């Protein structure tokens, strides 16, 4: 699927 790259994890 489409995506927008990494995000802040936790």
């Amino acid at each position, epitope marked *: 699927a489409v995506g*927008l790259g990494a*995000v802040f994890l936790g």
Partner: antibody
Amino acid sequence: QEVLVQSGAEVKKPGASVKVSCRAFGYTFTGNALHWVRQAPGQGLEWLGWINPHSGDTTTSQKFQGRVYMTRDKSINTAFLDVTRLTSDDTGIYYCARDKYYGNEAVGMDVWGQGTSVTVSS
Amino acid sequence: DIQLTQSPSFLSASVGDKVTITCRASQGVRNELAWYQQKPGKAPNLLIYYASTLQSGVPSRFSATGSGTHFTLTVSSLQPEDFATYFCQHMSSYPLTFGGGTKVEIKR
């Protein structure tokens, strides 16, 4: 716990712009991509685009490129939708919606704001 | 753009009935499809993702199947809270698009 709170109803003239805001509560704002989706009166759902609140990266539907701008302010956990050059075709209810965003891809819109009514009329 | 065609557009049923809604994609989208419920004056609520996994807190009388182009959503026993409009949505490529919706009304 996850909640999206949108700004209030807007009434604009043709050719004007509108800025709707969407503040995330109950989860880490920078952890999930956020969509913008609108619904004209009695019509279906139309996708405008989505934003990565961590990086500010966006993808905007070709129909709305040049007219729709998605930004965010991390300090207030708020994402913004700018819609310029409005016409009566833009009248409707505008939603922000969080994506589950498993594995950094689109999966499903699991949290929806309450919607912002935008009326474009003379 | 991938167009999603839902059938039927309108459905009449009774409490307790089993109903199946269909979503056909004009192109293959693998498992990258979600289902939503919407009631008048309310935002949609996510029911299904990955074409067949139930969203947390969704009742188990909802289930869904499908891969590629043909997808179905099933309510095993319609309850009063289930009368509403249902949408499919794909996310395999841009732009993300929704189906036209299937409205489920009360039979009388």
